[PDB]
Design a protein around this ligand. Structure first.
Ligand SMILES: CCCC[Se]C[C@@H](O)C[Se]c1ccc(S(N)(=O)=O)cc1
Ligand SMILES: CCCC[Se]C[C@H](O)C[Se]c1ccc(S(N)(=O)=O)cc1
Ligand SMILES: [Zn+2]
Length: 257
């Protein structure tokens, strides 16, 4: 099965998922000098005041914080988007060392980690339908750098001991994802894909320019997670990131000058 090892990692994925070599794959390097300011892009609208978190799951590739998406409770609108996109889950990608871990890069700079807040277009009715559509998903990407602690991340860090291994889940109610945002909502945007199999070309990527700061102790706790199931030999959950893919016939747009 696919993963991030020597034998099943990103360079192998094309054999089961040929769209891996497609025309709008993610992530990409954001060349900040080549991205064009698009004065017609709107401010992002992030409306998370009524978000209902439910559960946290170790899926063997990352951990997902899942939300109630059965109503318009936590939505993303505006920016490059037409219509309303409902928050379904967030997860991270991170490194074994602070100098790697992000999926997107900025002028080839790798951050320690990257947060993905995943949303689906409500005109398609459910997430499974939305991933079959070129405008089905909107993923809000936020870089993490190591420095000062992020206080709004700590409730996530403290539960990870309870979901160490693949298939473990824990109740995770009343978590406020607004605590993970930076101050500025300035962003880059481009059409892309899921960054894991099945690599479907269904994502409007919205990547915030301002990173959030997390502490070394916070990311060290991410790196204590396991890819393996309980009672299997330990394989630390680190370097769960896909490298940058060819931009091909795409333009990255900036919301800011
Ligand atoms: C609960 C608390 O942990 C969530 Se972080 C938070 C930070 C700022 C804002 S606001 N209204 O945009 O100034 C809202 C929420
Ligand atoms: C069977 C249900 C529908 C088929 Se999609 C299969 C599975 O649910 C992957 Se969900 C996924 C979401 C976000 C990302 S990312 N890193 O943000 O681009 C990656 C994957
Ligand atoms: Zn992701």
């Amino acid at each position: 099965h696919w993963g991030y090892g020597k034998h099943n990692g990103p360079e192998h994925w094309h054999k089961d998922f040929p769209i891996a070599k497609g025309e709008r794959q993610s992530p990409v390097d954001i060349d900040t000098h080549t991205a064009k300011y698009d004065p017609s892009l709107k401010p992002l609208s992030v409306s998370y005041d009524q978000a209902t978190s439910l559960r946290i799951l170790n899926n063997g590739h990352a951990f997902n914080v899942e939300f109630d998406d059965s109503q318009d409770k936590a939505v993303l609108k505006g920016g490059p988007l037409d219509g309303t996109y409902r928050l379904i889950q967030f997860h991270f990608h991170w490194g074994s060392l602070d100098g790697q871990g992000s999926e997107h890069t900025v002028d080839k700079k790798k951050y320690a980690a990257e947060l993905h807040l995943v949303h689906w277009n409500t005109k398609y009715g459910d997430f499974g339908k939305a991933v079959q559509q070129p405008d089905g998903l909107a993923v809000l990407g936020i870089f993490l750098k190591v420095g000062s602690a992020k206080p709004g991340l700590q409730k996530v860090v403290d539960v990870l001991d309870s979901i160490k291994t693949k298939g473990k889940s824990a109740d995770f109610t009343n978590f406020d994802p607004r605590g993970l945002l930076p101050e500025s909502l300035d962003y880059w945007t481009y059409p892309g894909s899921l960054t894991t199999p099945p690599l479907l070309e269904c994502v409007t990527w919205i990547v915030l320019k301002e990173p959030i700061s997390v502490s070394s102790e916070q990311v060290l706790k991410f790196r204590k997670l396991n890819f393996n199931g309980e009672g299997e030999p330990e394989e630390l959950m680190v370097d769960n990131w896909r490298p940058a893919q060819p931009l091909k016939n795409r333009q990255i747009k900036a919301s800011f000058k």
